[PDB]
Design an enzyme around this catalytic site. Sequence first.
Site, mmCIF file in Angstrom:
data_model
loop_
_atom_site.group_PDB
_atom_site.id
_atom_site.type_symbol
_atom_site.label_atom_id
_atom_site.label_comp_id
_atom_site.label_asym_id
_atom_site.label_seq_id
_atom_site.Cartn_x
_atom_site.Cartn_y
_atom_site.Cartn_z
ATOM 1 N N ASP A 306 0.799 -1.219 0.000
ATOM 2 C CA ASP A 306 0.000 0.000 0.000
ATOM 3 C C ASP A 306 0.835 1.273 0.000
ATOM 4 O O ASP A 306 1.951 1.301 0.513
ATOM 5 C CB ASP A 306 -0.895 0.027 1.236
ATOM 6 C CG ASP A 306 -0.089 0.078 2.524
ATOM 7 O OD1 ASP A 306 0.709 -0.854 2.758
ATOM 8 O OD2 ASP A 306 -0.243 1.048 3.294
ATOM 9 N N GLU A 307 0.262 2.323 -0.583
ATOM 10 C CA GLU A 307 0.871 3.645 -0.643
ATOM 11 C C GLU A 307 2.346 3.710 -1.033
ATOM 12 O O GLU A 307 3.123 4.469 -0.441
ATOM 13 C CB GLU A 307 0.642 4.342 0.701
ATOM 14 C CG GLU A 307 -0.811 4.228 1.148
ATOM 15 C CD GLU A 307 -1.080 4.809 2.523
ATOM 16 O OE1 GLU A 307 -0.354 4.478 3.485
ATOM 17 O OE2 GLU A 307 -2.040 5.591 2.645
#
Length: 499
Positions: A306-307
């Site tokens: 994620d991210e």
Amino acid sequence: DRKAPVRPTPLDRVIPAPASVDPGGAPYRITRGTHIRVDDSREARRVGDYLADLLRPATGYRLPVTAHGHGGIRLRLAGGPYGDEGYRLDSGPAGVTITARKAAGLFHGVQTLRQLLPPAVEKDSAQPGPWLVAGGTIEDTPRYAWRSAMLDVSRHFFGVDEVKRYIDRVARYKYNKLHLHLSDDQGWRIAIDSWPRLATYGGSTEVGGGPGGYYTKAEYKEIVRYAASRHLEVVPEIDMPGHTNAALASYAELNCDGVAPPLYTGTKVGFSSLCVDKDVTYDFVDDVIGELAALTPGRYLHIGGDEAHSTPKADFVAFMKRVQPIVAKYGKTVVGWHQLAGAEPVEGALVQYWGLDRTGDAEKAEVAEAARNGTGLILSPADRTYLDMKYTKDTPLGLSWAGYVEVQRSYDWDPAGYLPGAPADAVRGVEAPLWTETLSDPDQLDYMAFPRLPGVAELGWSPASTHDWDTYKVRLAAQAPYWEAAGIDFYRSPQVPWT
Ligand SMILES: [Cl-]
Ligand SMILES: [Cl-]
Ligand SMILES: [Cl-]
Ligand SMILES: [Cl-]
């Protein structure tokens, strides 16, 4: 008579809502001489002792656990349509009997029993009772096999005892998986022998600066053991290629420019990335995952994903193509945040969707397509089950980037039809993540976890037919005196008619 009602709480007043509740006859009453009868096996006695420990302080009773006689409370392993986690609970003047095929089913039956008993059962000193258990029969089985709660110990570190405390909080609602976010930008929380500085340096601080912390191999094994005794399968997460500053700050060589960034104590995200164009990167990942897998008796290994905003799309795809296989190499099933759906998930992989109502169709489609291709889906919408999200603009702790999330919004949805175009059978379950950028102590964890935590557990456990906010809020409201007696702080939402 909030603390000690004159009459027993209704048989159906429990969370998660049981699949089948058939109330009838008189209730059972636990008295000073009540014995806990179990089968003549280790696992059976184990659940018996767990139950006895829960009841001794408040009742002040001996509650011996034995494999002989006709105890008033009987836990028995037998055949039946209860699966690996279901059970049947019969209550009446003749006693209370919990029947299941496996220990987990008995354990779950116990979680229901503690809710049938009065709030006073939460006290640490002997109470008058009465220790009534409504009469009738309950037959209960789970809707989904993946019902987890995640604890972020990276932003703010929480020691073994604090983790055990959170484990006890979630065990109340039949969650069966504990997702531990072991690394991020503000800290690395697991000792890796092949790379010593990750823990000694990468774990030296946390959000806001000051002391950090980490689990030695022994401490981690103890958390896994304790979680297992509470029937929680531990799913460890080492986020990559993003959220890796703790690791990057520990070893200069892992950085693209060969310079170690400072340890991070802020509360932002998306700036860190492992260097995809370096070979040492994959030696590092292999070493970490190999050592983590060895400490993981569970079936899954979460690699995040994620991210990774400092990781160009093509690099992200290339990175994941290379690392996913490392998980299978060490005998585990890979799990990643839904960004992984854009990087060809390997066979058997599961992705955790943390999107929102407002998420764009292109992103939702990519996840639904992965589900179509066989990828399992774990639902934890940021505007639904992220426990760190504020209730309203006035909530003193938490974040608000996903908008505000009151109790009804967190509960009022159906996992089966949540993601447009996604096959219902691809949905493995749900998760309630508790991020800690703003939480530094156990009480703050409770205030943000409760009262939404029980609701997510219901979405993962109860039949869609039992889902209804108006009646659910009444069952939730009933928990108030129990939490108060247990010393569990919670947000008294105005949407709930608190008892
Ligand atoms: Cl607890
Ligand atoms: Cl150790
Ligand atoms: Cl910053
Ligand atoms: Cl940010």
